[PDB]
């Protein structure tokens, strides 16, 4: 039993949250190029046989609601769960279109005791977002 | 009898704790570009951690920022794999 069982009827959901345009009230920069990412991911995970759902420009409230609702689905016939977050961020934080939400609040919905039909199944969160404002200057090889 | 409630999560972060993450306005983000390329090339051949390790190398080696602003120019990035998985993951 070294490998997850991936031969359930369905590979599982792939939820892609693609936040490009943010409310003026926040000022955050429009994330040019993120639509290329979202389409790339949609096609990539389609070829992996995931049930992809693309969602664009979600408020922090809408993100929490979508994650809550998805966590309350019956995943019994699904091998895994994938969630992709494309947005601005800070350490521990991703931005809805109207402000920051803790990553922990999003992932907590899928905890082993809170989403029983994903127990023992891989829950993947793929996060394209800043985690601070440091730059890596690199070092010559 | 029980498993930890935090078990079986994998967080594939685009960048290291504390750091900016880079996105190209025409090509897409460095990390998602590389992630999709490595999944396309290796999802039928490689376990997921080894796929993500090749993503790390691709982002680390083939990308460097170009900016008219010298303070943002010639910068690098390393993604950050955070695994609480208990098993190997193959997509085939």
């Amino acid at each position: 039993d070294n490998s997850y069982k991936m031969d359930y009827p369905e590979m599982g959901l792939c939820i892609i949250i693609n936040n490009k345009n943010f409310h003026k009230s926040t000022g955050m920069t429009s994330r040019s190029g993120t639509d290329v990412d979202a389409a790339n991911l949609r096609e990539t995970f389609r070829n992996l046989k995931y049930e992809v759902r693309n969602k664009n420009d979600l408020t922090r409230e809408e993100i929490v609601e979508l994650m809550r609702d998805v966590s309350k689905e019956d995943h019994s016939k699904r091998s895994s769960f994938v969630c992709v977050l494309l947005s601005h961020g800070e350490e521990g934080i991703i931005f809805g279109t109207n402000g920051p939400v803790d990553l922990k609040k999003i992932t907590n919905f899928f905890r082993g005791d809170r989403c029983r039909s994903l127990d023992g199944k891989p829950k993947l969160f793929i996060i394209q977002a800043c985690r601070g404002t440091e730059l890596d200057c690199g070092i010559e090889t | 009898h029980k498993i930890p409630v935090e078990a079986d999560f994998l967080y594939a972060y685009s960048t290291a704790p504390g750091y900016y993450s880079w996105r190209n306005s025409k090509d897409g983000s460095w990390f998602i570009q590389s992630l999709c390329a490595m999944l396309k090339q290796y999802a039928d051949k490689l376990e997921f951690m080894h796929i993500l390790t090749r993503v790390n190398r691709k982002v680390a080696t083939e990308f460097e920022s170009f900016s008219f602003d010298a303070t943002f120019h010639a910068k690098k990035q390393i993604p950050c794999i955070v695994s609480m998985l208990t098993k190997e993951l193959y997509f085939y």
């Binding site: 994330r31 190029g33 | 685009s14 900016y20 880079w22 996105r23 306005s25 983000s29 943002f72």
Partner: peptide, 4 residues
């Protein structure tokens, strides 16, 4: 190239 832009930061996130």
């Amino acid at each position: 190239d832009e930061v996130d």
